[PDB]
Design a protein around this ligand. Structure first.
Ligand code: BM1
Lengths: 491, 373
């Protein structure tokens, strides 16, 4: 006898009137629903049933749990059958109608959840330091009480629940820690990801290679150093999920490598709200960033890898910024607060950057950590034209259909050059002309262009791009002593 | 008793995701709601209710007590339907948060489910607490309209005893003509004035003038571009042929006042762009049709923000919205020069208004910035 959840059907609809398929106190009228073996097909009813508030679609991260001296899991049997179905909505379930939440119905998981929350509320009020986590049919109960007092408390919970018809496994039949939940291995004082066995094969198909890479990633969450690049060349051009791909010489290397890394076990400690949160970020190769979050030096709560080209043209500062933004977003979810950052960029580099970037950009409280490689700015465009430096008036243009173009320049000093391009685009020819001025000029240049497009890319100080051409332009720019780019209207 | 309110025909309630909130804000909301429930303002809801609205906490102008803020933007776009041209001329307008009044009035019982909102829990450790208003909620467009006949009926004596002062109501606020709108000025385009001019100088000038001619076609750069004929050193000084001096003069004159034929049409969306200049400076333009600016402005950061671009932006955005309401009686749609996630993460930290304007994120062109400062 737990309060009943009222339920209607989507406006302008009526209960399922689906004929019965010919075949061979929880249930007691123009409707009917298919039933056989006892599995009911409520697909039609569900398509008639109103919408309910989402079920727990976001699960907790171990990194954000607090240490408990003892933990227990209680699986609730006959969960759904233990809760009453809206008296009025009962008719629409005829098949003999239900009096309880039906297995396989739309609002069952939700109403059950809502019910459990209301049943737990009392017991919770009385037990403020006993933490209960509801996850489908399971009840995870942790506390800081010693082994015996804890057992006594679980027994209270079991009885409270029993008052409501909810039965649970006694101490003898309960499952004991650690808990294997959603790819994790939970201990009352430490966590980790469940066992990772890299198959030792001599015949790998596409399905094996993909699953492997699949397992590898999920581990990187705690095992920094793993690599998947030399395996992720094994999929290129694969004809089918059963095509057996021979592990290249380098493919057995990376694997053997990871295989070894995975041999040494690493455990994530839990969260202590009395201490500060701290995240440190390293630049692990161009475009790849790593990070670890902790409260005590080396006792990581969570660690991670980022590799996201936010577009096509960026730099380490912008990349550093985004990494910080993602870590911040995770942090708010998991712990409810932003960690203090330890970043590999000097205050003055960051200052120079955000102060003159056209986009509002910000980084929460952080401090420089001197760990090479440091993120810096590879070149700074001159704020005013350079005296004594040659001036290149560049120009590019390509017919958008023949993809035929020309790019070149003319300097104040009489220097001129015109190159013909093929299979090019206007933009590419505009970039090309700038490229040329840079190539053929000294350590100091004044470059005039009519390309807003090129002007924009370059002014943003990119240092990494997908465009080979933009990358050549960066290389040149890094070499120059002074470069002043200036725009002028075209035509 | 309650007045029947409804969603626009055929439409349904809002199911907008709740953004993650910090521990501080969650505790804050939890304390605020627990009492609101005690006063019957809000009441817990079951799973039978599929709707939702985002909520967060803010801290009003120089106040230390938390203010629950519900982003009813979605519910407002779906709520069925139901300006003092002198206000902008007033010497001093004051903003009075008269949002609490709404609580005294009950909300149609049939409409309440659409006001559903959720208070999240850190790390999803719990299912979150769900409520729905039983009274006119703060920040909903229905509330000010419903509490209208009543709001006037109480401001009947003051505007008859003082029919001089203007009273304007926009959502949860009251504007009595602390703003000083008689000092609001539109940033006019401005060409450089210099002793000497280098090739570079004239180029930039010709550039700005080219752009400016999109708004003022009378502008001519013919004479100036001749002084550019040839391929000379950027740093090479160029004396102005007199034909140019005059060409530069007319342009100046043309840019001494806003362009003609620029009226405000209340049947069109009001748009606002913002550019980050630097040195904590921010330009903006309000228009409805490209190049036909209803207003152009400038914003200087306030203290305690020198190190924070996002605060500046949000402060600027609120500054600009206030001007919109104080002038047209509407909030514009913002084109925010900032990465969506950066913004969506901290805006709620520097926000103090009770309304939330609409926004989108852009990639400001280099040129346009050189043209607005
Ligand atoms: C998200 C989740 C899943 C399973 C168990 C828990 C659980 S059981 C009760 C809540 N949790 C804790 O505080 C905790 C700490 C260490 C181990 C287990 C737990 C939490």
């Amino acid at each position: 006898p737990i309060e009943t959840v009222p339920v209607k059907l989507k406006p302008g609809m009526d209960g399922p009137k689906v004929k019965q398929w010919p075949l061979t106190g929880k249930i007691s009228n123009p409707y009917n629903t298919p039933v056989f073996a006892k599995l009911v097909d409520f697909r039609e009813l569900n398509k008639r049933t109103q919408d309910f508030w989402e079920v727990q679609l976001g699960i907790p991260h171990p990194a954000g749990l607090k240490k408990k001296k003892s933990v227990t899991v209680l699986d609730v049997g006959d969960a759904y059958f233990s809760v009453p179905l809206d008296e009025d909505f009962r008719k629409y379930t005829a098949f003999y109608q239900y009096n309880v939440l039906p297995q396989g119905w739309k609002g069952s998981p939700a109403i059950f959840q809502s019910s459990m929350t209301k049943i737990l509320e009392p017991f919770r009020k009385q037990n403020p330091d006993i933490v209960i986590y509801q996850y489908m049919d399971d009840l995870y109960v942790g506390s800081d009480l010693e082994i015996g007092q804890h057992r006594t408390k679980i027994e209270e919970l079991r009885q409270h629940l029993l008052r409501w018809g909810l039965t649970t496994p006694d101490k003898k039949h309960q499952k004991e820690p650690p808990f294997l939940w959603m790819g994790y291995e939970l201990h009352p004082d430490k966590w980790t990801v469940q066992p990772i066995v890299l198959p030792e094969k001599d015949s790998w198909t596409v399905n094996d290679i993909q699953k492997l890479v699949g397992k590898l990633n999920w581990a990187s969450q705690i095992y920094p150093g793993i690599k998947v690049r030399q395996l992720c060349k094994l999929l290129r051009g694969t004809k089918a999920l059963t095509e057996v791909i021979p592990l290249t010489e380098e493919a057995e290397l990376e694997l053997a490598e990871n295989r070894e890394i995975l041999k040494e076990p690493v455990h994530g400690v839990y969260y202590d709200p009395s201490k500060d949160l701290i995240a440190e970020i390293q630049k692990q190769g161009q475009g790849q960033w790593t990070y670890q979050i902790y409260q005590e030096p080396f006792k990581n709560l969570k660690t991670g890898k980022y590799a996201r080209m936010r577009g096509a043209h960026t730099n380490d500062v912008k990349q550093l910024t985004e990494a910080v933004q993602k870590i911040t977003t995770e942090s708010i979810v998991i712990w409810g607060k932003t960690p203090k950052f330890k970043l590999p960029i000097q205050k003055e580099t960051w200052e120079t950057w955000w102060t003159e970037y056209w986009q509002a950009t910000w980084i929460p409280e952080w401090e420089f950590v001197n760990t090479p490689p440091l993120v810096k700015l590879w070149y700074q465009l001159e704020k005013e034209p350079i005296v004594g430096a040659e001036t290149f008036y560049v120009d590019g243009a390509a017919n958008r259909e023949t993809k035929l173009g020309k790019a070149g320049y003319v300097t104040n000093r009489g220097r001129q050059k015109v190159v013909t391009l093929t299979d090019t685009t206007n933009q590419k020819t505009e970039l090309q002309a700038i490229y040329l001025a840079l190539q053929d000029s000294g350590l100091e240049v004044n470059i005039v262009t009519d390309s807003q497009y090129a002007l924009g890319i370059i002014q943003a100080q990119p240092d990494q791009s997908e465009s080979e051409l933009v990358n050549q332009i960066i290389e040149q720019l890094i070499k120059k002593e002074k470069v002043y780019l200036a725009w002028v209207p075209a035509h | 008793e309650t007045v029947p309110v409804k969603l626009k025909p055929g439409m349904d309630g809002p199911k907008v995701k709740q953004w993650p909130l910090t521990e501080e804000k969650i505790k804050a909301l939890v304390e605020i709601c627990t009492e609101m429930e005690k006063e019957g303002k809000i009441s817990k809801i079951g799973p039978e209710n599929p709707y939702n609205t985002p909520v967060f906490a803010i801290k009003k102008k120089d106040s230390t007590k938390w203010r629950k803020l519900v982003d009813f933007r979605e519910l407002n776009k779906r709520t069925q339907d139901f300006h003092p041209a002198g206000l902008k001329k007033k010497k001093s307008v004051t903003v009075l948060d008269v949002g609490d009044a709404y609580f005294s009035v009950p909300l149609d019982e049939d409409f309440r489910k659409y006001t559903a909102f959720t208070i999240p829990s850190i790390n999803n450790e719990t299912p979150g607490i769900r409520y729905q208003y039983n009274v006119l909620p703060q920040g909903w467009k229905g509330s000010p309209a419903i509490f209208q006949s009543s709001m006037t009926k109480i401001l009947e004596p003051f505007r008859k005893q003082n029919p001089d002062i203007v009273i304007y109501q926009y959502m949860d606020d009251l504007y009595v003509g602390e703003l000083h709108p008689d000092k609001w000025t539109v940033q006019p385009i401005v060409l450089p004035e210099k002793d000497s001019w280098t090739v570079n100088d004239i180029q930039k000038l010709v550039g700005k003038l080219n752009w400016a001619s999109q708004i003022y076609p009378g502008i001519k750069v013919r004479q100036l571009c001749k002084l550019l004929r040839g391929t000379k050193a950027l740093t090479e000084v160029i004396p102005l042929t007199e034909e140019a001096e005059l060409e530069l003069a007319e342009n100046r004159e043309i840019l001494k006042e806003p362009v003609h034929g620029v009226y405000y049409d209340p049947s069109k969306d009001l748009i606002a762009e913002i550019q980050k200049q630097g040195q904590g400076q921010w330009t903006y333009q309000i228009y409805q049709e490209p190049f036909k600016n209803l207003k152009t402005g400038k914003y200087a950061r306030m203290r305690g923000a020198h190190t924070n671009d996002v605060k500046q932006l949000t402060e600027a955005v609120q500054k600009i919205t206030t001007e919109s309401i104080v002038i047209w009686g509407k909030t514009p749609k913002f084109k925010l020069p900032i990465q969506k996630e950066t913004w969506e993460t901290w805006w709620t930290e520097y926000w103090q208004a009770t309304w939330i304007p609409e926004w989108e994120f852009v990639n400001t062109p280099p040129l346009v910035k050189l043209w607005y400062q």
